[PDB]
């Protein structure tokens, strides 16, 4: 069992450590200053993310950080969920040391300014489905907020579900029909199928480089399109495999009673393919970052 405070376990090795052992390399991402830091563990050279939860901080927020951390700590055996290396507890702060990902899919799309290849999305789909399934099966957690910002990638070619909100209960953009409008009054609660829909939308957005409801000027207009319009499917003339089109058509079934749960999606040929097909996500990632690098 991982040493949950005063230690960092990284690689397979446990290191006694404390906050002064980390060099602060600044905000982990744009406007993350004061709260999530990129830091270098001086003893090993590892560069990690450190979330700083101030004791004086917002209480609801700290409650969510703690719930999410509880789930991350008990998700040590899931390869598809970002890992906690350890924590440091001082009189004024908790520092939560996390795996450092390069970017989320939302920032990746913004930086790319175009379609993300099918092969990359195949590996992504496998990782995220397996992460969501693990969460529900092991921890009883319905994620409730699947979208590109919660899908993380790195230069090692790993693709993992973000810790943010990973404990479950704008991005109304990704809301399933039945979540917008529970078709049964007497049994109103959406379930994991609503996250399936969100995954489908996310895939189409990433595959095309266009959010499927882009021409909407208000959040409510987007909800009206989700309900009134045919599900926004993959185009037929971008060379997408029939497996990918099917996978997405399945995820985007409007009638949630006919939409696959994770168990069923894990049988899909799209997933079976990308479980075993070798895809060099690492090289791809490094290449596209290099091609889109702005001078310092």
JSON list of C-alpha atoms in Angstrom, two decimals, residues 85-277:
[
{"chain": "A", "resi": 85, "resn": "UNK", "atom": "CA", "xyz": [2.79, 9.69, -5.92]},
{"chain": "A", "resi": 86, "resn": "UNK", "atom": "CA", "xyz": [2.25, 10.91, -2.38]},
{"chain": "A", "resi": 87, "resn": "UNK", "atom": "CA", "xyz": [1.36, 13.91, -0.21]},
{"chain": "A", "resi": 88, "resn": "UNK", "atom": "CA", "xyz": [3.00, 16.37, 2.21]},
{"chain": "A", "resi": 89, "resn": "UNK", "atom": "CA", "xyz": [0.91, 17.82, 5.07]},
{"chain": "A", "resi": 90, "resn": "UNK", "atom": "CA", "xyz": [2.04, 20.99, 6.78]},
{"chain": "A", "resi": 91, "resn": "UNK", "atom": "CA", "xyz": [0.27, 23.22, 9.29]},
{"chain": "A", "resi": 92, "resn": "UNK", "atom": "CA", "xyz": [-1.15, 25.39, 6.47]},
{"chain": "A", "resi": 93, "resn": "UNK", "atom": "CA", "xyz": [-1.24, 23.16, 3.36]},
{"chain": "A", "resi": 94, "resn": "UNK", "atom": "CA", "xyz": [-1.65, 19.76, 1.85]},
{"chain": "A", "resi": 95, "resn": "UNK", "atom": "CA", "xyz": [0.59, 19.17, -1.26]},
{"chain": "A", "resi": 96, "resn": "UNK", "atom": "CA", "xyz": [-0.70, 16.32, -3.44]},
{"chain": "A", "resi": 97, "resn": "UNK", "atom": "CA", "xyz": [1.97, 14.95, -5.78]},
{"chain": "A", "resi": 98, "resn": "UNK", "atom": "CA", "xyz": [0.47, 13.72, -9.03]},
{"chain": "A", "resi": 99, "resn": "UNK", "atom": "CA", "xyz": [1.68, 12.32, -12.39]},
{"chain": "A", "resi": 100, "resn": "UNK", "atom": "CA", "xyz": [2.42, 15.25, -14.72]},
{"chain": "A", "resi": 101, "resn": "UNK", "atom": "CA", "xyz": [0.53, 15.01, -18.00]},
{"chain": "A", "resi": 102, "resn": "UNK", "atom": "CA", "xyz": [1.60, 17.12, -21.04]},
{"chain": "A", "resi": 103, "resn": "UNK", "atom": "CA", "xyz": [-1.83, 18.43, -21.98]},
{"chain": "A", "resi": 104, "resn": "UNK", "atom": "CA", "xyz": [-5.56, 17.60, -22.04]},
{"chain": "A", "resi": 105, "resn": "UNK", "atom": "CA", "xyz": [-7.45, 16.80, -25.23]},
{"chain": "A", "resi": 106, "resn": "UNK", "atom": "CA", "xyz": [-9.12, 20.21, -25.14]},
{"chain": "A", "resi": 107, "resn": "UNK", "atom": "CA", "xyz": [-5.77, 22.04, -25.21]},
{"chain": "A", "resi": 108, "resn": "UNK", "atom": "CA", "xyz": [-4.45, 19.50, -27.74]},
{"chain": "A", "resi": 109, "resn": "UNK", "atom": "CA", "xyz": [-7.33, 20.27, -30.07]},
{"chain": "A", "resi": 110, "resn": "UNK", "atom": "CA", "xyz": [-6.77, 24.05, -29.61]},
{"chain": "A", "resi": 111, "resn": "UNK", "atom": "CA", "xyz": [-3.06, 23.71, -30.33]},
{"chain": "A", "resi": 112, "resn": "UNK", "atom": "CA", "xyz": [-3.54, 21.34, -33.31]},
{"chain": "A", "resi": 113, "resn": "UNK", "atom": "CA", "xyz": [-6.15, 23.54, -34.96]},
{"chain": "A", "resi": 114, "resn": "UNK", "atom": "CA", "xyz": [-7.48, 20.50, -36.71]},
{"chain": "A", "resi": 115, "resn": "UNK", "atom": "CA", "xyz": [-8.44, 16.76, -36.63]},
{"chain": "A", "resi": 116, "resn": "UNK", "atom": "CA", "xyz": [-6.73, 14.34, -34.32]},
{"chain": "A", "resi": 117, "resn": "UNK", "atom": "CA", "xyz": [-5.93, 11.09, -36.18]},
{"chain": "A", "resi": 118, "resn": "UNK", "atom": "CA", "xyz": [-8.18, 8.02, -35.76]},
{"chain": "A", "resi": 119, "resn": "UNK", "atom": "CA", "xyz": [-5.30, 5.90, -34.54]},
{"chain": "A", "resi": 120, "resn": "UNK", "atom": "CA", "xyz": [-4.72, 8.30, -31.62]},
{"chain": "A", "resi": 121, "resn": "UNK", "atom": "CA", "xyz": [-8.40, 8.44, -30.84]},
{"chain": "A", "resi": 122, "resn": "UNK", "atom": "CA", "xyz": [-8.57, 4.58, -30.89]},
{"chain": "A", "resi": 123, "resn": "UNK", "atom": "CA", "xyz": [-5.94, 4.41, -28.17]},
{"chain": "A", "resi": 124, "resn": "UNK", "atom": "CA", "xyz": [-7.75, 7.26, -26.31]},
{"chain": "A", "resi": 125, "resn": "UNK", "atom": "CA", "xyz": [-11.11, 5.46, -26.50]},
{"chain": "A", "resi": 126, "resn": "UNK", "atom": "CA", "xyz": [-9.71, 2.27, -25.07]},
{"chain": "A", "resi": 127, "resn": "UNK", "atom": "CA", "xyz": [-8.04, 4.15, -22.19]},
{"chain": "A", "resi": 128, "resn": "UNK", "atom": "CA", "xyz": [-11.04, 6.33, -21.30]},
{"chain": "A", "resi": 129, "resn": "UNK", "atom": "CA", "xyz": [-13.70, 3.56, -21.53]},
{"chain": "A", "resi": 130, "resn": "UNK", "atom": "CA", "xyz": [-11.49, 1.35, -19.39]},
{"chain": "A", "resi": 131, "resn": "UNK", "atom": "CA", "xyz": [-10.99, 4.17, -16.90]},
{"chain": "A", "resi": 132, "resn": "UNK", "atom": "CA", "xyz": [-14.73, 4.95, -16.71]},
{"chain": "A", "resi": 133, "resn": "UNK", "atom": "CA", "xyz": [-15.61, 1.28, -16.40]},
{"chain": "A", "resi": 134, "resn": "UNK", "atom": "CA", "xyz": [-13.07, 0.79, -13.61]},
{"chain": "A", "resi": 135, "resn": "UNK", "atom": "CA", "xyz": [-14.45, 3.78, -11.76]},
{"chain": "A", "resi": 136, "resn": "UNK", "atom": "CA", "xyz": [-18.03, 2.44, -11.96]},
{"chain": "A", "resi": 137, "resn": "UNK", "atom": "CA", "xyz": [-17.15, -1.22, -11.34]},
{"chain": "A", "resi": 138, "resn": "UNK", "atom": "CA", "xyz": [-14.67, -0.82, -8.53]},
{"chain": "A", "resi": 139, "resn": "UNK", "atom": "CA", "xyz": [-15.73, 2.38, -6.82]},
{"chain": "A", "resi": 140, "resn": "UNK", "atom": "CA", "xyz": [-19.42, 2.76, -7.83]},
{"chain": "A", "resi": 141, "resn": "UNK", "atom": "CA", "xyz": [-18.57, 6.14, -9.36]},
{"chain": "A", "resi": 142, "resn": "UNK", "atom": "CA", "xyz": [-20.51, 7.61, -12.23]},
{"chain": "A", "resi": 143, "resn": "UNK", "atom": "CA", "xyz": [-18.11, 10.26, -13.55]},
{"chain": "A", "resi": 144, "resn": "UNK", "atom": "CA", "xyz": [-20.80, 12.65, -14.83]},
{"chain": "A", "resi": 145, "resn": "UNK", "atom": "CA", "xyz": [-18.46, 15.04, -16.76]},
{"chain": "A", "resi": 146, "resn": "UNK", "atom": "CA", "xyz": [-16.73, 13.33, -19.67]},
{"chain": "A", "resi": 147, "resn": "UNK", "atom": "CA", "xyz": [-15.25, 15.90, -22.08]},
{"chain": "A", "resi": 148, "resn": "UNK", "atom": "CA", "xyz": [-11.91, 16.62, -23.74]},
{"chain": "A", "resi": 149, "resn": "UNK", "atom": "CA", "xyz": [-10.49, 18.60, -20.73]},
{"chain": "A", "resi": 150, "resn": "UNK", "atom": "CA", "xyz": [-10.67, 15.47, -18.60]},
{"chain": "A", "resi": 151, "resn": "UNK", "atom": "CA", "xyz": [-8.71, 13.34, -21.09]},
{"chain": "A", "resi": 152, "resn": "UNK", "atom": "CA", "xyz": [-5.03, 13.68, -20.52]},
{"chain": "A", "resi": 153, "resn": "UNK", "atom": "CA", "xyz": [-2.04, 12.84, -22.75]},
{"chain": "A", "resi": 154, "resn": "UNK", "atom": "CA", "xyz": [1.66, 12.84, -22.32]},
{"chain": "A", "resi": 155, "resn": "UNK", "atom": "CA", "xyz": [4.96, 12.60, -24.24]},
{"chain": "A", "resi": 156, "resn": "UNK", "atom": "CA", "xyz": [5.34, 8.99, -23.08]},
{"chain": "A", "resi": 157, "resn": "UNK", "atom": "CA", "xyz": [2.20, 8.23, -25.16]},
{"chain": "A", "resi": 158, "resn": "UNK", "atom": "CA", "xyz": [0.00, 7.60, -22.12]},
{"chain": "A", "resi": 159, "resn": "UNK", "atom": "CA", "xyz": [-3.65, 8.58, -22.18]},
{"chain": "A", "resi": 160, "resn": "UNK", "atom": "CA", "xyz": [-5.43, 8.82, -18.84]},
{"chain": "A", "resi": 161, "resn": "UNK", "atom": "CA", "xyz": [-8.53, 10.17, -17.18]},
{"chain": "A", "resi": 162, "resn": "UNK", "atom": "CA", "xyz": [-7.91, 13.36, -15.19]},
{"chain": "A", "resi": 163, "resn": "UNK", "atom": "CA", "xyz": [-8.36, 13.40, -11.37]},
{"chain": "A", "resi": 164, "resn": "UNK", "atom": "CA", "xyz": [-10.53, 16.57, -11.53]},
{"chain": "A", "resi": 165, "resn": "UNK", "atom": "CA", "xyz": [-14.03, 15.60, -10.52]},
{"chain": "A", "resi": 166, "resn": "UNK", "atom": "CA", "xyz": [-13.11, 11.93, -10.80]},
{"chain": "A", "resi": 167, "resn": "UNK", "atom": "CA", "xyz": [-15.21, 11.22, -7.66]},
{"chain": "A", "resi": 168, "resn": "UNK", "atom": "CA", "xyz": [-18.37, 12.37, -9.62]},
{"chain": "A", "resi": 169, "resn": "UNK", "atom": "CA", "xyz": [-21.29, 14.35, -8.00]},
{"chain": "A", "resi": 170, "resn": "UNK", "atom": "CA", "xyz": [-21.07, 25.04, -20.60]},
{"chain": "A", "resi": 171, "resn": "UNK", "atom": "CA", "xyz": [-20.18, 21.35, -20.84]},
{"chain": "A", "resi": 172, "resn": "UNK", "atom": "CA", "xyz": [-23.99, 21.22, -21.38]},
{"chain": "A", "resi": 173, "resn": "UNK", "atom": "CA", "xyz": [-22.33, 20.91, -24.74]},
{"chain": "A", "resi": 174, "resn": "UNK", "atom": "CA", "xyz": [-21.65, 17.19, -23.82]},
{"chain": "A", "resi": 175, "resn": "UNK", "atom": "CA", "xyz": [-24.92, 16.45, -22.02]},
{"chain": "A", "resi": 176, "resn": "UNK", "atom": "CA", "xyz": [-26.94, 13.37, -23.03]},
{"chain": "A", "resi": 177, "resn": "UNK", "atom": "CA", "xyz": [-30.61, 13.89, -24.14]},
{"chain": "A", "resi": 178, "resn": "UNK", "atom": "CA", "xyz": [-31.99, 12.02, -21.09]},
{"chain": "A", "resi": 179, "resn": "UNK", "atom": "CA", "xyz": [-29.83, 14.10, -18.79]},
{"chain": "A", "resi": 180, "resn": "UNK", "atom": "CA", "xyz": [-31.15, 17.28, -20.30]},
{"chain": "A", "resi": 181, "resn": "UNK", "atom": "CA", "xyz": [-34.71, 15.88, -20.17]},
{"chain": "A", "resi": 182, "resn": "UNK", "atom": "CA", "xyz": [-35.33, 12.67, -18.10]},
{"chain": "A", "resi": 183, "resn": "UNK", "atom": "CA", "xyz": [-37.99, 10.92, -20.31]},
{"chain": "A", "resi": 184, "resn": "UNK", "atom": "CA", "xyz": [-39.41, 9.10, -17.30]},
{"chain": "A", "resi": 185, "resn": "UNK", "atom": "CA", "xyz": [-40.55, 11.49, -14.56]},
{"chain": "A", "resi": 186, "resn": "UNK", "atom": "CA", "xyz": [-40.90, 8.65, -11.99]},
{"chain": "A", "resi": 187, "resn": "UNK", "atom": "CA", "xyz": [-37.32, 7.34, -12.59]},
{"chain": "A", "resi": 188, "resn": "UNK", "atom": "CA", "xyz": [-35.49, 10.60, -13.57]},
{"chain": "A", "resi": 189, "resn": "UNK", "atom": "CA", "xyz": [-31.79, 9.68, -12.73]},
{"chain": "A", "resi": 190, "resn": "UNK", "atom": "CA", "xyz": [-29.39, 9.36, -15.69]},
{"chain": "A", "resi": 191, "resn": "UNK", "atom": "CA", "xyz": [-26.65, 6.65, -15.36]},
{"chain": "A", "resi": 192, "resn": "UNK", "atom": "CA", "xyz": [-23.30, 5.72, -17.02]},
{"chain": "A", "resi": 193, "resn": "UNK", "atom": "CA", "xyz": [-25.00, 5.81, -20.43]},
{"chain": "A", "resi": 194, "resn": "UNK", "atom": "CA", "xyz": [-25.10, 9.63, -20.17]},
{"chain": "A", "resi": 195, "resn": "UNK", "atom": "CA", "xyz": [-21.23, 9.52, -19.95]},
{"chain": "A", "resi": 196, "resn": "UNK", "atom": "CA", "xyz": [-21.23, 7.25, -23.02]},
{"chain": "A", "resi": 197, "resn": "UNK", "atom": "CA", "xyz": [-22.97, 9.92, -25.00]},
{"chain": "A", "resi": 198, "resn": "UNK", "atom": "CA", "xyz": [-20.46, 12.54, -23.72]},
{"chain": "A", "resi": 199, "resn": "UNK", "atom": "CA", "xyz": [-17.62, 10.26, -24.92]},
{"chain": "A", "resi": 200, "resn": "UNK", "atom": "CA", "xyz": [-19.25, 10.07, -28.31]},
{"chain": "A", "resi": 201, "resn": "UNK", "atom": "CA", "xyz": [-19.56, 13.84, -28.68]},
{"chain": "A", "resi": 202, "resn": "UNK", "atom": "CA", "xyz": [-15.99, 14.25, -27.52]},
{"chain": "A", "resi": 203, "resn": "UNK", "atom": "CA", "xyz": [-14.76, 11.77, -30.15]},
{"chain": "A", "resi": 204, "resn": "UNK", "atom": "CA", "xyz": [-16.61, 13.47, -32.99]},
{"chain": "A", "resi": 205, "resn": "UNK", "atom": "CA", "xyz": [-15.29, 16.89, -31.87]},
{"chain": "A", "resi": 206, "resn": "UNK", "atom": "CA", "xyz": [-11.70, 15.56, -31.73]},
{"chain": "A", "resi": 207, "resn": "UNK", "atom": "CA", "xyz": [-11.95, 13.53, -34.98]},
{"chain": "A", "resi": 208, "resn": "UNK", "atom": "CA", "xyz": [-13.33, 16.50, -36.98]},
{"chain": "A", "resi": 209, "resn": "UNK", "atom": "CA", "xyz": [-11.75, 19.42, -35.16]},
{"chain": "A", "resi": 210, "resn": "UNK", "atom": "CA", "xyz": [-15.25, 20.91, -34.89]},
{"chain": "A", "resi": 211, "resn": "UNK", "atom": "CA", "xyz": [-17.53, 20.69, -31.88]},
{"chain": "A", "resi": 212, "resn": "UNK", "atom": "CA", "xyz": [-20.72, 19.16, -33.39]},
{"chain": "A", "resi": 213, "resn": "UNK", "atom": "CA", "xyz": [-22.96, 22.09, -32.13]},
{"chain": "A", "resi": 214, "resn": "UNK", "atom": "CA", "xyz": [-20.47, 25.01, -32.94]},
{"chain": "A", "resi": 215, "resn": "UNK", "atom": "CA", "xyz": [-23.06, 27.40, -34.53]},
{"chain": "A", "resi": 216, "resn": "UNK", "atom": "CA", "xyz": [-24.98, 27.84, -31.28]},
{"chain": "A", "resi": 217, "resn": "UNK", "atom": "CA", "xyz": [-24.85, 31.27, -29.68]},
{"chain": "A", "resi": 218, "resn": "UNK", "atom": "CA", "xyz": [-26.25, 30.31, -26.26]},
{"chain": "A", "resi": 219, "resn": "UNK", "atom": "CA", "xyz": [-26.10, 27.32, -23.97]},
{"chain": "A", "resi": 220, "resn": "UNK", "atom": "CA", "xyz": [-29.84, 26.73, -24.24]},
{"chain": "A", "resi": 221, "resn": "UNK", "atom": "CA", "xyz": [-29.63, 26.62, -28.03]},
{"chain": "A", "resi": 222, "resn": "UNK", "atom": "CA", "xyz": [-27.14, 23.82, -27.70]},
{"chain": "A", "resi": 223, "resn": "UNK", "atom": "CA", "xyz": [-29.57, 21.84, -25.47]},
{"chain": "A", "resi": 224, "resn": "UNK", "atom": "CA", "xyz": [-32.32, 22.32, -28.14]},
{"chain": "A", "resi": 225, "resn": "UNK", "atom": "CA", "xyz": [-30.05, 20.86, -30.80]},
{"chain": "A", "resi": 226, "resn": "UNK", "atom": "CA", "xyz": [-29.08, 17.84, -28.64]},
{"chain": "A", "resi": 227, "resn": "UNK", "atom": "CA", "xyz": [-32.88, 17.12, -28.29]},
{"chain": "A", "resi": 228, "resn": "UNK", "atom": "CA", "xyz": [-34.27, 18.15, -31.66]},
{"chain": "A", "resi": 229, "resn": "UNK", "atom": "CA", "xyz": [-31.61, 17.11, -34.10]},
{"chain": "A", "resi": 230, "resn": "UNK", "atom": "CA", "xyz": [-30.28, 13.79, -35.29]},
{"chain": "A", "resi": 231, "resn": "UNK", "atom": "CA", "xyz": [-27.17, 12.72, -33.38]},
{"chain": "A", "resi": 232, "resn": "UNK", "atom": "CA", "xyz": [-24.07, 14.32, -34.90]},
{"chain": "A", "resi": 233, "resn": "UNK", "atom": "CA", "xyz": [-22.27, 11.36, -36.52]},
{"chain": "A", "resi": 234, "resn": "UNK", "atom": "CA", "xyz": [-18.80, 11.03, -38.08]},
{"chain": "A", "resi": 235, "resn": "UNK", "atom": "CA", "xyz": [-18.61, 12.24, -41.65]},
{"chain": "A", "resi": 236, "resn": "UNK", "atom": "CA", "xyz": [-18.38, 9.65, -44.44]},
{"chain": "A", "resi": 237, "resn": "UNK", "atom": "CA", "xyz": [-15.62, 11.24, -46.55]},
{"chain": "A", "resi": 238, "resn": "UNK", "atom": "CA", "xyz": [-12.75, 11.70, -44.08]},
{"chain": "A", "resi": 239, "resn": "UNK", "atom": "CA", "xyz": [-11.53, 8.08, -44.42]},
{"chain": "A", "resi": 240, "resn": "UNK", "atom": "CA", "xyz": [-12.77, 6.96, -40.93]},
{"chain": "A", "resi": 241, "resn": "UNK", "atom": "CA", "xyz": [-12.90, 3.16, -40.47]},
{"chain": "A", "resi": 242, "resn": "UNK", "atom": "CA", "xyz": [-16.39, 1.52, -40.37]},
{"chain": "A", "resi": 243, "resn": "UNK", "atom": "CA", "xyz": [-15.39, 0.38, -36.85]},
{"chain": "A", "resi": 244, "resn": "UNK", "atom": "CA", "xyz": [-14.90, 3.97, -35.70]},
{"chain": "A", "resi": 245, "resn": "UNK", "atom": "CA", "xyz": [-18.16, 5.18, -37.33]},
{"chain": "A", "resi": 246, "resn": "UNK", "atom": "CA", "xyz": [-20.09, 2.29, -35.67]},
{"chain": "A", "resi": 247, "resn": "UNK", "atom": "CA", "xyz": [-18.46, 2.94, -32.29]},
{"chain": "A", "resi": 248, "resn": "UNK", "atom": "CA", "xyz": [-19.54, 6.52, -32.45]},
{"chain": "A", "resi": 249, "resn": "UNK", "atom": "CA", "xyz": [-23.03, 5.80, -33.80]},
{"chain": "A", "resi": 250, "resn": "UNK", "atom": "CA", "xyz": [-23.42, 3.39, -30.85]},
{"chain": "A", "resi": 251, "resn": "UNK", "atom": "CA", "xyz": [-22.27, 5.95, -28.26]},
{"chain": "A", "resi": 252, "resn": "UNK", "atom": "CA", "xyz": [-24.57, 8.59, -29.84]},
{"chain": "A", "resi": 253, "resn": "UNK", "atom": "CA", "xyz": [-27.82, 6.61, -29.64]},
{"chain": "A", "resi": 254, "resn": "UNK", "atom": "CA", "xyz": [-30.42, 9.17, -28.63]},
{"chain": "A", "resi": 255, "resn": "UNK", "atom": "CA", "xyz": [-32.64, 6.61, -26.90]},
{"chain": "A", "resi": 256, "resn": "UNK", "atom": "CA", "xyz": [-30.55, 5.86, -23.80]},
{"chain": "A", "resi": 257, "resn": "UNK", "atom": "CA", "xyz": [-32.40, 2.58, -23.30]},
{"chain": "A", "resi": 258, "resn": "UNK", "atom": "CA", "xyz": [-30.68, 1.40, -26.49]},
{"chain": "A", "resi": 259, "resn": "UNK", "atom": "CA", "xyz": [-27.30, 2.99, -25.78]},
{"chain": "A", "resi": 260, "resn": "UNK", "atom": "CA", "xyz": [-24.48, 0.59, -24.79]},
{"chain": "A", "resi": 261, "resn": "UNK", "atom": "CA", "xyz": [-23.03, 0.52, -21.29]},
{"chain": "A", "resi": 262, "resn": "UNK", "atom": "CA", "xyz": [-19.29, 0.08, -20.86]},
{"chain": "A", "resi": 263, "resn": "UNK", "atom": "CA", "xyz": [-19.41, -3.72, -20.83]},
{"chain": "A", "resi": 264, "resn": "UNK", "atom": "CA", "xyz": [-20.92, -3.72, -24.29]},
{"chain": "A", "resi": 265, "resn": "UNK", "atom": "CA", "xyz": [-18.54, -1.04, -25.60]},
{"chain": "A", "resi": 266, "resn": "UNK", "atom": "CA", "xyz": [-15.61, -3.17, -24.40]},
{"chain": "A", "resi": 267, "resn": "UNK", "atom": "CA", "xyz": [-16.81, -5.84, -26.91]},
{"chain": "A", "resi": 268, "resn": "UNK", "atom": "CA", "xyz": [-16.81, -3.40, -29.85]},
{"chain": "A", "resi": 269, "resn": "UNK", "atom": "CA", "xyz": [-14.38, -4.25, -32.71]},
{"chain": "A", "resi": 270, "resn": "UNK", "atom": "CA", "xyz": [-13.08, -0.65, -32.49]},
{"chain": "A", "resi": 271, "resn": "UNK", "atom": "CA", "xyz": [-11.89, -1.29, -28.94]},
{"chain": "A", "resi": 272, "resn": "UNK", "atom": "CA", "xyz": [-10.68, -4.90, -29.67]},
{"chain": "A", "resi": 273, "resn": "UNK", "atom": "CA", "xyz": [-8.59, -3.48, -32.51]},
{"chain": "A", "resi": 274, "resn": "UNK", "atom": "CA", "xyz": [-6.94, -0.74, -30.44]},
{"chain": "A", "resi": 275, "resn": "UNK", "atom": "CA", "xyz": [-6.27, -3.02, -27.47]},
{"chain": "A", "resi": 276, "resn": "UNK", "atom": "CA", "xyz": [-3.67, -4.85, -29.59]},
{"chain": "A", "resi": 277, "resn": "UNK", "atom": "CA", "xyz": [-2.82, -2.60, -32.58]}
]
